């Protein structure tokens, strides 16, 4: 392509312009309404027991009449607690190896550069 940078420049300008307009609309929504999100939602627990932000959809009938929405479950039963702990312990092991590894690199980084004691 002759000048590929041309496309990168336009894409950056199209994104900057979309940032400005959305910035003016967000500020105008905080003044009239006070909401930080343009789309409604809520914090809920899924069938798996993990926290998730539910983004609402547009419907014509209330939620207590909808066949398909009421088949969806937003609550976890007691057989999930053990898996939540097993998944928490999995993240802790990862975070521990990451922290102990960084300490090792720093301890090995003084053997070759011993003037970093300060």
């Amino acid at each position: 392509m002759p000048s590929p940078e041309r496309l990168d420049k336009v894409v950056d300008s199209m994104d900057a312009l979309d940032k400005v307009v959305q910035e003016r609309e967000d500020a105008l929504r905080l003044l009239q309404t006070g909401q930080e999100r343009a789309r409604p939602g809520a914090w809920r627990r899924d069938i798996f027991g993990r926290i998730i932000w539910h983004k609402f959809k547009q419907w014509v009938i209330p939620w207590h009449l909808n066949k398909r929405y009421n088949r969806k479950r937003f609550f976890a039963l007691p057989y999930v607690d053990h898996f939540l702990r097993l998944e928490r312990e999995k993240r802790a092991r990862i975070k521990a190896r990451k922290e102990n590894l960084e300490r090792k690199k720093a301890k090995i980084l003084l053997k070759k550069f011993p003037h970093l004691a300060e």
């Binding site: 609402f56 959809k57 419907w59 009938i61 939620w63 929405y69 550069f113």
Partner: protein
């Protein structure tokens, strides 16, 4: 975009080049080079800055810094610490020999004082206006950041606006008047569109 493996080894050739791809394929895994951690603020060597070589084949020589590689704390100076390599070779023709420079660590070079052409050590400081600068320890004098041509290559002092380049008087003109209307509402009033139908309420869940 950027696709660098976890332990990608930076080198003289820029990333993503055909030479770097052949040198650093996605699959290879090499021992990571150890680099002394230096704060971006503390780094005091920039392109276009004279430096004196302390250790090497040709020590005591001063040369301009053409390239700097922060990842490996390398400084490249033109015409110094240079070996020879045949370029443009072919199967029939041996090729042309050229001197190729080798990178130098930030500890193997030493900045020179503009007043006296001797190696000196510098420590950052602040001037009256507040702009941060680097000052020599011995015979403290200011050492400004040498002007270096931009990477893209554009020279502002030699720019000619084209047919698709907005003018300075049209790109800096202020036309915005803070109001309490959205682009949608403000545009429908100017374009002349009218919509009397109302939007019936929906349920959100």
């Amino acid at each position: 975009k950027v696709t660098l493996p976890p332990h990608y080894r930076y080198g003289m050739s820029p990333p993503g080049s055909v030479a770097d791809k052949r040198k650093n394929p996605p699959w290879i895994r090499r021992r990571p080079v150890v680099v002394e951690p230096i704060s971006d603020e503390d780094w005091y060597l920039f392109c276009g800055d004279t430096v004196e070589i302390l250790e090497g084949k040709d020590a005591g020589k001063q040369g301009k810094v053409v390239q700097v590689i922060r990842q490996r704390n390398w400084v490249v100076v033109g015409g110094l610490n240079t070996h020879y390599r045949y370029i443009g070779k072919t199967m029939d023709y041996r090729g042309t020999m050229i001197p190729s420079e080798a990178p130098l660590l930030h500890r193997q070079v030493k900045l020179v004082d503009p007043m006296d052409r001797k190696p000196t050590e510098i420590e950052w400081r602040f001037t009256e206006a507040g702009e941060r600068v680097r000052v020599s320890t011995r015979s403290g004098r200011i050492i400004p950041k040498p002007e270096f041509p931009r990477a893209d290559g554009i020279v502002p002092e030699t720019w000619i606006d084209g047919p698709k380049d907005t003018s300075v008087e049209d790109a800096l003109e202020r036309t915005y008047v803070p109001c309490l209307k959205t682009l949608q509402e403000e545009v429908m009033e100017a374009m002349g569109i009218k919509e009397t139908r109302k939007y019936k309420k929906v349920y959100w869940y």
